[PDB]
């Protein structure tokens, strides 16, 4: 459940991310710095809401949401999206819709690490995070 994700995570490895970035139409200037930064993602629960903070040398982002309740999200690549995060078994599914398009993130816990899968059509990226000290 959500508890399993409530920790501080540090990005260690990214697979197929540049490809995915470019499928999204992410501009070059955001892309090249998105390939080298290793963000710190801090997930917690305030009341009944999940809070996701992201510390990065490019941008610091923060979002709050209740599971299943749609909300406006301005992504780090400046996409104004209608987003929904829900529980899917033991995984979190984050859906983003914008400009008639859609992309999805799947957060899971495999072997102690947080594995996040990003899908835009047939283009898929996988991002790996290790638990770090709070």
Ligand X SMILES: CC(C)CCC[C@@H](C)[C@H]1CC[C@H]2[C@@H]3CC=C4C[C@@H](O)CC[C@]4(C)[C@H]3CC[C@]12C
Min dist. Cβ of residue 68 to ligand X (A) = 20
User: 128 a known binding residue?
Assistant: yes
CB-nearer residue toward ligand X: 56 or 67: 56
CB-nearer residue toward ligand X: 78 or 90: 78
CB-nearer residue toward ligand X: 32 or 45: 32
Min dist. Cβ of residue 47 to ligand X (A) = 22
Q: Over the Cα atoms of the chain, what is R_g?
A: 14
Nearest by Cα to 45 from 2, 95, 105: 2
Q: How far is CA 21 from CA 32, 116, 118, 124, in A?
A: 10, 14, 10, 10
Count how many residues are written for the chain.
Answer: 134
Residue matched to tokens 């899917």: 88
Min dist. Cβ of residue 31 to ligand X (A) = 7
Min dist. Cβ of residue 107 to ligand X (A) = 9
User: 129 a known binding residue?
Assistant: yes
Q: Which residues bind ligand X (CB under 6 A)?
A: 11, 21, 24, 26, 30, 33-34, 37, 39, 41, 54, 56, 58-59, 75-77, 105, 116, 127
Q: How far is CA 98 from CA 24, 31, 83, 116, 119, in A?
A: 11, 19, 9, 20, 15
Give the residue ranges of the annotated binding site for a fatty acid.
127-129
């Amino acid at each position: 459940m959500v508890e399993a994700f409530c920790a501080t995570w540090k990005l260690t490895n990214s697979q197929n991310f540049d490809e995915y970035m470019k499928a999204l139409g992410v501009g070059f200037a955001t892309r090249q710095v998105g390939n080298v930064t290793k963000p710190t993602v801090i997930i917690s629960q305030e009341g009944d809401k999940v809070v996701i903070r992201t510390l990065s040398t490019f941008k610091n982002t923060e979002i709050s949401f209740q599971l299943g309740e749609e909300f406006d999200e301005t992504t780090a690549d400046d996409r104004n999206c209608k987003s929904v995060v829900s529980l899917d078994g033991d995984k979190l599914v984050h859906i983003q819709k914008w400009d008639g398009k859609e992309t999805n993130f799947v957060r899971e816990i495999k072997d102690g690490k947080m594995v996040m899968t990003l899908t835009f059509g047939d283009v898929v990226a996988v991002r790996h995070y290790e638990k770090a000290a709070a």
